[PDB]
Write a protein that binds this DNA or RNA. Structure first.
Lengths: 95, 107, 93, 78, 95, 78, 107, 93
DNA sequence: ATCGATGTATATATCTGACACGTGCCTGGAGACTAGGGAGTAATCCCCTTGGCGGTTAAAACGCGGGGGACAGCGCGTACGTGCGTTTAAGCGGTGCTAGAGCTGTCTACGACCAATTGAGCGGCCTCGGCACCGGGATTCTGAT
DNA sequence: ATCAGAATCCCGGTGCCGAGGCCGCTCAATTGGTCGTAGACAGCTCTAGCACCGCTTAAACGCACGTACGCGCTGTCCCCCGCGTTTTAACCGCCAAGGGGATTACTCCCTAGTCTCCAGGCACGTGTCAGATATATACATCGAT
């Protein structure tokens, strides 16, 4: 049995739009945060809640951006999101 | 002297009028604070809190739950146009999003 | 070190509107953030109004105007009603 | 470390965003965007930390940075 | 002699992008302002500078919106701006 | 009175915005958008006027309304 | 007493330190204002003013003009990425826009 | 009725940077609005910092931090340099 | 190419009103001295951040087949740009008058401040019930026939 | 339409840990009184906003016509989805250490507050020169052949 392309994608949309857990891995995200912060100040410690706040904000921002990207793609009569779509969304948003 | 009667009880409010007054006086907002300002502010805050909590409790009951969670709060805020406008640039932690799939993507 | 919060009052309001409904700690934290945010917004707008009109006192009129400026539509209508009722009741002891 | 944000994670985020089909170049574009965002927020948080003469970035610092960038976050103490 | 479609349009773009005067008629704009204000409070007077400020802000806002609409049009492989383009721009902008 | 914003005017605005070709439905869409914007700004300005117990909407009122809607205007006293 | 020496002259500044101090004390910002704060603020304001004015004068000279106009100010601000970012959500009255035509529209 | 403005100082700076260049009344009004805006931004950020750190005094540290938070890149770098130089000169009379 | 039309830049001369300088005054800033309290500094304690080990399992990486979606090409028909004659009202200049913004004077209600009291609110401890995890049957829904 | 298979929903049982309640304490709000001042109200001035008339002319408007562009259809090929298999590293739990964040106590110097004075900056006035307008012109660009 093989589901036709799109079925599993829509099932995943429904599942993740129904769920609320964080989707980025904790350890990799933490490493990224520390690596980025290292360029500004050395020997920096981080509260667990600080890292959690960062993760929540980043995920929310990315979800919103993907929403606008989807809208741009659909506007161009496409169903696939592309870098040009991300670029348009960001440009219009003022970023 | 007479027994201490709280300003909240005098105004028929659950929110702390005295605390709101202190926060206004020590919040670097103005030189002076009128006597009615904390009462008014407390009443407004109470009304908004009541509204949100009521809508969240309704969502919880619809989900067969007895405790309000961030998900329920997010649902309540996003399903009301006015509340959504008020809290437009706000992210609710552990709230998720509203189920929304564009019609053009459906099979 | 004692850290003040609006938990108690939020709980009272919850018990008034939904006697059999509780609330999680996370949701309680959300409510605290919400109250603080709205407080800040209203107080700041009232402060600006006072400064614009060369007044040194933030009064119920300033609060009302801030509410009208910030809360959209019926939110503003009902908030204004509530504030006026509360002020009247307090002023009549 | 930027590679730790794997393709499946980005896909999950897109799914929550209602995206059905994803191009192969989206992962790299997304990684770059996320990096920029993070840099801005962390910069501001570290500025707050340094002003407080602290060595530990706090949740308050993060919250403040987000607030001043117009991305107010509820749930972490303000 | 007839210039081919597009030449005069581009000349107008250059001229209006080089000039700074207000492009909406003063009297009609003033009438619109007063008509709108009537619904909020009656017997309202208006400073000349107040009307001028409103006109300046409105024109700037509309120009910015037309810029974003143009970008949307180009994104959809079109050279003509459409209501769907305005709608997309505004949605992404947060309005 | 909304019709006073004539088609040539909208065209001029589009030209300043770099638009080369314009659809016929754009004029009505633009009129609606402008009306909404104006309503919001005027509402706030009138609120300020009423708070000041004045009968004349001032440039300061307009400036403040624009500022609070995140559309700061320079040149009219702030 | 000794002849009055302005704080501006002591700091080698053109912006009014005394005025900035008064505006800080009466602006409902804090309970107390340090002695160095007005000096620092005035210096920063002066620097920013100098930058904008220099760029506007350059634009004026390029336009064979001897007086700075809002157009020149707008050009100066929008042609500098950093200044544009700082003044992103600001509208300069009678400033116009930057000449920009999309490449796809050209003949 | 006297209405204070930054006209004199803006003009002074202009005559320092461009001795043969004047300025229109409209441009002067724009510059005044600019100065007021930046002042407000800086003072508000310094106030927030002070409140966050449970301090009652706005000092050069608060101003410096506010400048770093608001001014982007080299604007901040040079503004900080200018402020530090000015403070040093003032403190040494 | 090419020449003709044509709009647009450029060069010069008149005017004009708006900006740059001077003056008088007055009020806000500077010099001088005081108190007191806020912030700097030093010691302490404890909690909470960092680092390491191990297992184990869920998630990530990789390969592969294929189908459906991006994208390029083409035809057509219709909607929009360009130009021209007509008409409509916007603009400018003068004049009128009156509403209301703005300033001053006076005074009274009202909010800051201060000391004593006490009760509301917070930290800590305990328990039980809501929810979560597991497992298994029911229902839904999808795709190939 | 059918049917099988895969996924989700629901229903019930067990446990566990976090929300709700109770209690001691302590410090922050309340009460009662005093005093200065700020803003509420009356009244007067005089600015500027509104209303109108008339003339002019530039902008809007209606229409004709041609053509460039939007849009629908068709074909192709490539590259993303979906699924099976292997690998890897995330996560959970458990332990150890130490460093830095929060707290308290003492001191001192830095800023508010008051007074006295005086000079800088801000309305008012003026004159003169930069820029706007008009005209002629040169020049580059668009278009049809």
């Amino acid at each position: 049995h093989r589901y036709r392309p799109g079925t599993v994608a829509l099932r995943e949309i429904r599942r993740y739009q129904k769920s609320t857990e964080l989707l980025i891995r904790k350890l990799p995200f933490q490493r990224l945060v520390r690596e980025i912060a290292q360029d500004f100040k050395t020997d920096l410690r981080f509260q667990s809640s600080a890292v959690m706040a960062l993760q929540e904000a980043s995920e929310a921002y990315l979800v919103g951006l993907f929403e606008d990207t989807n809208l741009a793609a659909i506007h161009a009569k496409r169903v696939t999101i592309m870098p040009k779509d991300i670029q348009l969304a960001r440009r219009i948003r003022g970023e | 002297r007479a027994k201490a009667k709280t300003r909240s009880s005098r105004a028929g409010l659950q929110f702390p009028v005295g605390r709101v007054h202190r926060l206004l006086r020590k919040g670097n907002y103005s030189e002076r604070v009128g006597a009615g300002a904390p009462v008014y502010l407390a009443a407004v805050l109470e009304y908004l809190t009541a509204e949100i909590l009521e809508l969240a409790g309704n969502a919880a009951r619809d989900n067969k739950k007895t405790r309000i969670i961030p998900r329920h709060l997010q649902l309540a805020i996003r399903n009301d146009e006015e509340l959504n406008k008020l809290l437009g640039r706000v992210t609710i932690a552990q709230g998720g999003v509203l189920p929304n799939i564009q019609a053009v993507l459906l099979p | 070190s004692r850290k003040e919060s609006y938990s108690i009052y939020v709980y009272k309001v919850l018990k008034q509107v939904h006697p059999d409904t509780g609330i999680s700690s996370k949701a309680m934290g959300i409510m605290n953030s919400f109250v603080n945010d709205i407080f800040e917004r209203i107080a700041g707008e009232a402060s600006r109004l006072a400064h614009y009109n060369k007044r040194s006192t933030i009064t119920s009129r300033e609060i009302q105007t801030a509410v009208r400026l910030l809360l959209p539509g019926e939110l503003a209508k009902h908030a204004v009603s509530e504030g006026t009722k509360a002020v009247t009741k307090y002023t009549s002891a | 470390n930027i590679q730790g944000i794997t393709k499946p994670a980005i896909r999950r985020l897109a799914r929550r965003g209602g995206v059905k089909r994803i191009s192969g170049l989206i992962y790299e574009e997304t990684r770059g965007v996320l990096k920029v965002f993070l840099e801005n927020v962390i910069r501001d948080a570290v500025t707050y930390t340094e002003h407080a003469k602290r060595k530990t970035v706090t949740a308050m610092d993060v919250v403040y940075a987000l607030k001043r960038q117009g991305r107010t976050l509820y749930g972490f103490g303000g």
